[PDB]
Design a protein around this nucleic acid. Structure first.
Lengths: 54, 114, 146, 100, 47, 156, 124
RNA sequence: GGCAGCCAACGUGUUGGCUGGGUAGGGGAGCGUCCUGCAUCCGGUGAAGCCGCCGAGUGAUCGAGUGGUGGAGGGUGUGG
RNA sequence: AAGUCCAAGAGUGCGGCAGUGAGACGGCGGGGGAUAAGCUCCGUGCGUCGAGAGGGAAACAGCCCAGAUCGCCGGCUAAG
RNA sequence: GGUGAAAAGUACCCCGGGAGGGGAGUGAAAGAGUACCUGAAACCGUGCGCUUACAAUCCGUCAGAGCCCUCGACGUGUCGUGGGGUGAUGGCGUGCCUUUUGAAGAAUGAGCCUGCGAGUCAGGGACAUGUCGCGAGGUUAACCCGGGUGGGGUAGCCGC
């Protein structure tokens, strides 16, 4: 089918607001004497040196 | 007024909306937290946003002589810049329009005392 | 300029109406009048300046004719064939306060202010109510003669 | 004390010192106008008989003649092309009541 | 004296052109032609 | 639309495309199309009656005379070499108004050249005398020959 | 003499947009859609300005009826009695008394009741 | 209370009194835009345009009121 | 004969410049129809809508009341 | 098509791989940065104020509670002839256009904005409505002369 009316600004924006990113949950990891923030998912990899922290 | 530093990444090859998707994540946060969130954000638009935020922080540090630890992402927004028009051919020889949109990502980091 | 209720000049009063051997429609009309606040010289139709109306002995309301068995209260659930009808007598037996409630609600305006006004109605199917702390005024339905 | 005073085809509840906008009165700013009273209320004494009211008169100083809000009329009827644009500003007179 | 800016047409000499089809406050839309027909789009011959 | 280049072919089918019907890419509504009722070269001149023209000129000159704005001069400069300095001094002697219509004979080339470059001065011959110039000029400075020629032409 | 019509067009466009400032959606942004609502807005303004007199008279009458029945008299008989007594106070000020001066309203009610006939329903 | 034809007046005829829903359509009178004759004003001490504030007119609309942006023209009158 | 008396915005004639020549329903008198149609066709110094807002008919062009020059924190009523 | 008067077209430093920016400088002005005069609307953000998650809304209009600023009696927050917003709530409220007997109409057209887009011009044309000249007259056409819009030009035309 095809949109019959132009969607109003209010509806367009109400439903567009749902397209949002979720900020990652960052935990502290100590590497090379420095305290970096990495996802708890990558916590182990960062400890083992498998995360490129630049 | 808090001492502020500006940084504008103009004509970024990302949609204004897709830049805003991560600017929303890192608006209001400190500079360090913003850069961490943009480091670990899976959205590709986080890289131009991170670069412009870091440029604002560097301007605050060097041109303004502000303490980087006290910086905070005060006002950040992505406006839509120029849009190039491309043609994609479709069935029955019909040409649909494709919009290669750009974005101007403006950042203003203030030095606030926690 | 005409008087307009400002901020908290809307004073509320509690009335208790004995529904014993009273006509459902008359009781509902008086209760709707009180809940609207039409009895006050400060009435403004857009203000909920009415009064709290407790109705006691709702089960002992009176209905004339055959309304107790021939009149029905209908409710459609939104599903096909989902129209449930309950006579006034059955409704008064099962949910006695609901007959008086429905009468008063129907006599009240159907809008946001009407539903706000509804909250000041307290129907009870017995001689007593829990709002003695409010010191309700016994309200007898009396007609002003001409 | 106050009075329901008749002026400009309309009645106004005014006490001494009240400022009221009424219809245009043929009087200069600063002049005094005597207006008939539809009612007088002195605390609890309500003068309402016409015989007693004919004696009473609300005196009011004319502060100035003003114009009311700009009313904009656009008489429109659809599917006829009929539009009539019009403006209006009522000429009002402001009275400060001095006594009753 | 009489200069050029003192020259004016005779009273009632000049009359504004009837600029038709300019909004409904004047002879608008159909421009005095009425609704559909031959005369709505052309002139009927005199003969 | 017929004079604008191209546009002969119908832009597309009459039906099916889902677009408005067009018979020419140079139709007036089109960008780059022809102008519907636009200007065309035209002669604006009017065949004003001779009596009307002459009466208007005579009325303008009569107004100048009544207001004492008409002057007569033997010449504008003494000598055969034109001199705008001398012409300007003499015109200032005659009048102080900004615009003066100088009505001199054709053979008075010395005077014409002498006076022509003065800002508000307008130079014509008695045979070309006309109400527009007479009214445009605050004063009218006739040469004696020009005034006599005008009077003879309009009296004989 | 080609004439560009922007100067003339934008005038009415700005007028309508400024008038429709505050409207929800396209009605405050687009001149054409604002113009449609502005037609409706001003028709409604005219109609409601005519009907405001009736609406305020209704409000005054409701308040006067409330005060009258609080004084033990109906609004209709109160008006009848006031007319019989010759009291020419309009319903606006009757409602003003009802709200701000209940004692004065009661005095007027007493006047109206006294002026009423001995039997309001009598064939007279 | 405010606005739009006819009547009386004694005198310069502008005062008072009798008057108006509108489609097709007819008549009258105007608003705004541009270009121009002439006149006269404003303008790098800031024109136009644009965005406002404050207001204004019975309407189209107004802004020799005013702030911001702006950078070179423009307004007014009477005619075409 | 008068009445309408600051005239009806009357009738007539001559030139205006027209559009209109698809009407609708309601009441009365009829034709066709089955004395059906929100049917169709006529007549009606009949109405209304067309082209008519306002109030009542719950909503509801044509029914009823009533013809909107504009305002009013006024009053009396019409049909209801 | 338009930077600027002039490239004086931003040295140098900083963030960035660049792009793009921030200082610095040029410039009267970068609210002129080779994406460049002014920079409208549509359209897209960000910040602030009010409002909004029990509500049935042609989206407005009339009332209208509650939430900030302009002058003062008074001396300090409650008023006002005063002056903008935001809109809880109540009443009323069936888009515009075209075309129709009749459309909010589930009939047509329009997604939006800006710009453009439709009774115009020629001709001694024809028919009707203010002005020059008459006094029975008005006019000239082609053409001639004038460096013009002026002067001549009686053929003809219309009245008679």
């Amino acid at each position: 089918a095809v949109p019959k009316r132009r969607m109003s600004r209010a509806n367009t924006r109400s439903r567009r607001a749902q397209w949002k990113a979720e900020a990652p949950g960052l935990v502290t990891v100590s590497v090379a004497g420095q305290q970096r923030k990495v996802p708890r998912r990558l916590l182990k990899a960062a400890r083992l040196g498998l995360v490129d922290l630049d | 007024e808090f001492p502020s530093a500006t940084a504008k990444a103009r004509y970024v090859r990302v949609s204004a909306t897709k830049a805003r998707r991560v600017i929303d994540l890192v608006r209001g946060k400190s500079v360090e937290e913003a850069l961490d969130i943009l480091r670990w954000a899976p959205q590709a638009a986080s890289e131009p946003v991170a670069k412009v935020i870091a440029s604002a922080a560097a301007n605050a540090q060097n041109n303004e002589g502000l303490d980087p630890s006290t910086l905070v992402v005060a006002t950040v927004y992505a406006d839509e810049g120029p849009t190039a028009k491309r043609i994609r051919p479709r069935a029955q020889g019909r040409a649909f329009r494709i919009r290669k949109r750009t974005s101007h990502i403006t950042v203003i980091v203030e030095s606030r005392p926690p | 300029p005409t008087y307009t209720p400002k901020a908290g000049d809307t004073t509320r009063s509690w009335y208790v109406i004995d529904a014993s051997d009273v006509v459902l429609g008359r009781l509902a009309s008086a209760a709707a009048t009180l809940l609207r606040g039409k009895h006050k010289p400060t009435f403004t139709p857009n203000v909920d300046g009415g009064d709290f109306v407790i109705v006691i002995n709702a089960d002992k309301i009176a209905v004339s004719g055959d309304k107790l068995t021939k009149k029905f209260a209908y409710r459609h659930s939104g599903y096909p064939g989902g129209l449930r009808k309950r006579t006034i007598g059955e409704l008064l037996e099962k949910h006695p306060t609901r007959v008086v409630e429905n009468a008063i609600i129907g006599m009240l305006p159907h809008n946001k202010l009407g539903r706000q006004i509804q909250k000041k109605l307290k129907v009870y199917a017995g001689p007593d109510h829990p709002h003695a702390a409010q010191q309700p005024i016994p309200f007898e339905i009396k007609q002003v003669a001409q | 004390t106050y009075a329901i005073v008749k002026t400009g085809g309309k009645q106004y509840k005014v006490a001494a010192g009240d400022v009221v906008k009424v219809e245009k009165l043929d009087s200069e700013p600063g002049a005094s106008v005597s207006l008939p009273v539809a009612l007088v209320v002195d605390g609890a004494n309500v003068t309402s008989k016409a015989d007693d009211l004919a004696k009473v008169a609300v005196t009011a100083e004319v502060l100035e003649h003003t114009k009311g809000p700009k009313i904009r009329i656009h008489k429109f009827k659809n599917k006829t092309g009929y539009h009539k644009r019009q403006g209006h500003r009522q000429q009002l007179t402001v009275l400060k009541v001095t006594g009753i | 004296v009489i200069k050029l800016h003192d020259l004016k047409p005779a009273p009632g000499e000049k009359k504004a052109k009837t600029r038709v089809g300019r909004g409904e406050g004047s002879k608008g839309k159909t421009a005095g032609r009425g609704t559909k027909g031959t005369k709505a789009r052309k002139n009927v011959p005199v003969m | 639309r017929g004079e604008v280049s191209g546009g002969g072919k119908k832009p597309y089918r009459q039906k099916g495309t889902g677009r408005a019907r067009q018979g020419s890419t140079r139709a007036p509504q089109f960008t780059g199309g022809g102008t519907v009722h636009g200007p065309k070269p035209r002669d604006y001149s009017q065949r004003t009656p001779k009596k009307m023209i002459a009466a208007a000129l005579r009325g303008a000159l009569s107004d100048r005379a009544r207001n004492d704005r008409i002057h007569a001069v033997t010449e504008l400069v003494e000598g055969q070499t034109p001199s705008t300095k001398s012409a300007k001094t003499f015109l200032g002697t005659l009048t102080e108004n900004k615009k003066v219509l100088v009505v001199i004979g054709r053979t008075d080339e010395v005077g014409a050249k002498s006076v022509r470059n003065l800002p508000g001065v307008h130079v014509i011959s008695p045979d070309q005398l006309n109400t527009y110039d007479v009214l445009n000029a605050d004063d009218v400075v006739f040469s004696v020959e020009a005034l006599n020629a005008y009077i003879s032409a309009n009296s004989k | 003499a080609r004439v560009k019509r922007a100067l003339n067009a934008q005038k009415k466009r700005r007028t309508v947009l400024k008038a429709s400032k505050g409207y929800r959606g396209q009605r405050s942004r687009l001149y054409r859609k604002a113009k449609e609502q502005q037609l409706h807005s001003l028709t409604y303004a005219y109609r409601d300005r005519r009907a405001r007199k009736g609406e305020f008279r209704k409000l005054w009458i409701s308040r006067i009826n409330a005060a009258a029945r609080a004084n033990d008299i109906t609004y209709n008989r109160l008006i009848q009695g006031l007319k019989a007594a010759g009291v020419e106070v309009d319903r606006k000020n009757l409602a003003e008394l009802a709200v701000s001066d209940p004692a004065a309203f009661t005095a007027l009610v007493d006047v109206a009741r006294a002026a009423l006939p001995e039997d309001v329903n009598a064939p007279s």
